[PDB]
Write a protein that binds this ligand. Structure first.
Ligand SMILES: O=C(O)c1ccccc1/C=N/n1c(S)nnc1-c1ccc(C(F)(F)F)cc1
Ligand SMILES: [Ca+2]
Ligand SMILES: [Ca+2]
Ligand SMILES: [Zn+2]
Ligand SMILES: [Zn+2]
Length: 231
């Protein structure tokens, strides 16, 4: 709590001199607020965003918070897979004139998932690293596709010059008792994908994820341990 800022429906937490976490909440009618996290990154004189909020209105609130608190232009956004918690606000980013980037497969699945596709598609080598020509001027964002897990399209992001990596919805916290909704999951490859994310970002000590508070690297090995049990 203490330290967090609220702006409309959203909550913001500073993780590092130039990195903040954004949290938005879906109101599940019977259940109440379900939190989802993304990241905001100040890169010199511009801002980069990872993930939308659940809805367009909430995504607009992120951008307005950036305008109010950082007052630097948002140069691009990258969304980490084609479900509502990470791509629900695409229309808001587009309306705001932010260039948007997603895994090619996310963009291909988006219509069927009821999401709006990003403008640009990222592609990935066999070793999981983004093909650099598809991610121009990403500054410190290092984008890595670990393999199928939470979904087949899930990607992850590390921030150069920080100790932070973002596992999105693939990674659960180190006290988690399950892997959550596995309805679109690849149960066979999940564990290796979790470990691959760990290997991509070997010096990250702060692991940020969609549905828990930032954790140590314990979150990675813990998720992989649970995932091992799906085979
Ligand atoms: O199941 C979990 O792991 C979990 C745990 C805790 C909080 C959220 C989630 C899952 N959120 N989520 C992911 S991750 N990908 N998609 C969705 C989603 C959820 C609801 C809707 C709906 F309610 F609005 F329909 C849509 C998407
Ligand atoms: Ca919409
Ligand atoms: Ca689905
Ligand atoms: Zn999902
Ligand atoms: Zn999620």
């Amino acid at each position: 709590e203490t330290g967090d800022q609220r702006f409309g429906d959203l909550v913001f937490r500073q993780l590092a001199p130039n990195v903040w976490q954004h949290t938005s909440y879906l109101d599940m009618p019977g259940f109440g607020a379900v939190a989802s996290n993304g990241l905001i990154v100040r890169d010199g004189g511009r801002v980069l965003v990872v993930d939308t909020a659940w809805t367009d209105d909430q995504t607009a609130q992120i951008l307005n918070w950036i305008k109010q608190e950082i007052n630097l232009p948002v140069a691009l956004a990258v969304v980490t897979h084609a479900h509502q918690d990470k791509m629900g606000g695409m229309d808001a980013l587009h309306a705001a004139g932010i260039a948007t980037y997603a895994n090619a497969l996310s963009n291909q699945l988006a219509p069927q998932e009821g999401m709006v596709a990003a403008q640009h598609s990222l592609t990935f080598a066999a070793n999981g690293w983004v093909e650099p020509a598809t991610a121009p001027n990403f500054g410190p964002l290092k984008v890595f596709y670990p393999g199928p897990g939470h979904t087949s399209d899930n990607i992850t992001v590390g921030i150069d010059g920080t100790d932070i990596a973002f596992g999105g919805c693939l990674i659960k916290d180190s006290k988690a008792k399950s892997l959550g909704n596995l309805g679109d999951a690849d149960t066979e490859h999940y564990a290796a994908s979790a470990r691959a994310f760990g290997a991509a970002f070997p010096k990250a000590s702060m692991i940020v994820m969609s549905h828990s508070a930032p954790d140590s690297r314990a979150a990675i090995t813990h998720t992989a341990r649970m995932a091992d049990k799906l085979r």
